[PDB]
């Protein structure tokens, strides 16, 4: 097979996004015949240079996930990616740890296939334009740049939350993400710091292409704003050296291969 073209000729641009209708994954699976068990897909007519693992931090967000799958699967295939979907389900009912789950995703997906690109996406963010590439670039990529909840612009210029993409080398260079941001807030800013402290800069599509929708939702219990976040982001340069991939442990409790995604249920513990 020849290499796929540099830019996909299948993209249609702006799309209409809605979250007020029910979603039936069995139907979605039928609508997406070429997506194999575990939510895997690669174009059959050409070889994609983008071997992407999409990592979603998760717990009790099945409804949002259904919307995510319904909308992203068609987009990822049009982008001609060799990809896999991984939902990292946090076992238990103790304080949520978004970034630690993301690290588990990176490590576990690598055991599946030689992925060289990682897209980290919150479960409730849907891209509105398929020209917003869900793959890696020469520099870390911020994808959800113009979310409706922020007035279709960045909340601040160093904002790196929501959806982003790091190549395997970029991720390894920053020792992955921090493992000690329990509860809401700051871990995305810590990650931004790690990238800068390792000589990188943020790459972003323009504001129109980067338009993204956030599914309105209320506060989840067990992910209360972390009071130590402001203090933690002030010391990233020092703490990233020993807190991240090189200090990670967890226990996978179960791996489920669903038609549209692989769900890894994992015990990431509590604060130490």
Ligand X SMILES: CC(=O)N[C@H]1[C@H](O[C@@H]2[C@@H](OC[C@H]3O[C@@H](O)[C@@H](O)[C@@H](O)[C@@H]3O)O[C@H](CO)[C@@H](O)[C@@H]2O)O[C@H](CO)[C@@H](O)[C@@H]1O
Ligand Y SMILES: NCCCCCCOP(=O)(O)OP(=O)(O)OC[C@H]1O[C@@H](n2ccc(=O)[nH]c2=O)[C@H](O)[C@@H]1O
- Looking at residues 78 to 97 of the shown chain, list those that interact with ligand Y (rule: CB under 6 A): 96
Consecutive H or E run containing 142: strand 141-142
Identify which of residues 1 and 230 has a Cβ nearer to ligand X in the complex. 230
Is 82 within 8 Å of 41 (Cβ atoms)? yes
What character string, x for contact with ligand Y (CB under 6 A) and - otherwise, covers 192-221? --------------------------xxx-
| 122 touches ligand Y (CB under 6 A) | yes
Q: Residue 109: phi, psi to the nearest 5?
A: -60, -35
Return the range that interacts with Mn ion (CB under 5 A); candidates 47-55, 70-78, 120-128, 224-232: 120-128
C-alpha R_g of the chain: 18
Q: How far is the CB of 94 from ligand Y (least distance, A)?
A: 11
- Looking at residues 80 to 119 of the shown chain, list those that interact with ligand X (rule: CB under 6 A): none
- Looking at residues 228 to 247 of the shown chain, list those that interact with ligand X (rule: CB under 6 A): 229-230, 233
Is 185 within 8 Å of 155 (Cβ atoms)? no
Identify which of residues 42 and 125 has a Cβ nearer to Mn ion in the complex. 125
C-alpha angle 268/118/55, rounded to 5°?
45
Reading the block at residue 221, the tokens are 């219990």
Q: Strand, helix or coil at 52? A: strand
What character string, x for contact with ligand X (CB under 6 A) and - otherwise, covers 152-191? ---xx-x--x-----------------------xx-xx--
For residues 245-262, b (16+ Cβ closer than 10 Å) or e, as one string? eeebebeeeeeeeebbbb
Identify which of residues 43 and 161 has a Cβ nearer to ligand Y in the complex. 161
Interface residues toward ligand X, by CB under 6 A: 155-156, 158, 161, 185-186, 188-189, 229-230, 233
Interface residues toward Mn ion, by CB under 5 A: 124
């Amino acid at each position: 097979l020849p290499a796929c073209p540099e830019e996909s000729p299948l993209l249609v641009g702006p799309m209409l996004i809605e979250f007020n209708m029910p979603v039936d994954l069995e139907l979605v699976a039928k609508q997406n015949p070429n997506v194999k068990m575990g939510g895997r897909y690669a174009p059959r007519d050409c070889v994609s240079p983008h071997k992407v693992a999409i990592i979603i931090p998760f717990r009790n967000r099945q409804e949002h996930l259904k919307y995510w799958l319904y909308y992203l699967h068609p987009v990822l295939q049009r982008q001609q990616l060799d990809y896999g979907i991984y939902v990292i389900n946090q076992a238990g009912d103790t304080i949520f740890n978004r970034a630690k789950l993301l690290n588990v995703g990176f490590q576990e997906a690598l055991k599946d296939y030689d992925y060289t690109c990682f897209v980290f996406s919150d479960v409730d963010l849907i891209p509105m334009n398929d020209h917003n590439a869900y793959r890696c670039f020469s520099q870390p990529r911020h994808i959800s740049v113009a979310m409706d909840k922020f007035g279709f612009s960045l909340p601040y210029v160093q904002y790196f939350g929501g959806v982003s993409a790091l190549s395997k080398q970029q991720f390894l260079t920053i020792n992955g993400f921090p493992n000690n941001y329990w509860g809401w807030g700051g871990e995305d800013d810590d990650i931004f710091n790690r990238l800068v402290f390792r000589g990188m800069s943020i790459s972003r599509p323009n504001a129109v292409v980067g338009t993204t929708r956030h599914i309105r939702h209320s506060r989840d219990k067990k992910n209360e704003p972390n009071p130590q976040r402001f203090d933690r982001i002030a010391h990233t340069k020092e703490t990233m050296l020993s807190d991240g991939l090189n200090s990670l442990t967890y226990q996978v409790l179960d791996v489920q291969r669903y038609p549209l995604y692989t769900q890894i249920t994992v015990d990431i513990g509590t604060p130490s």
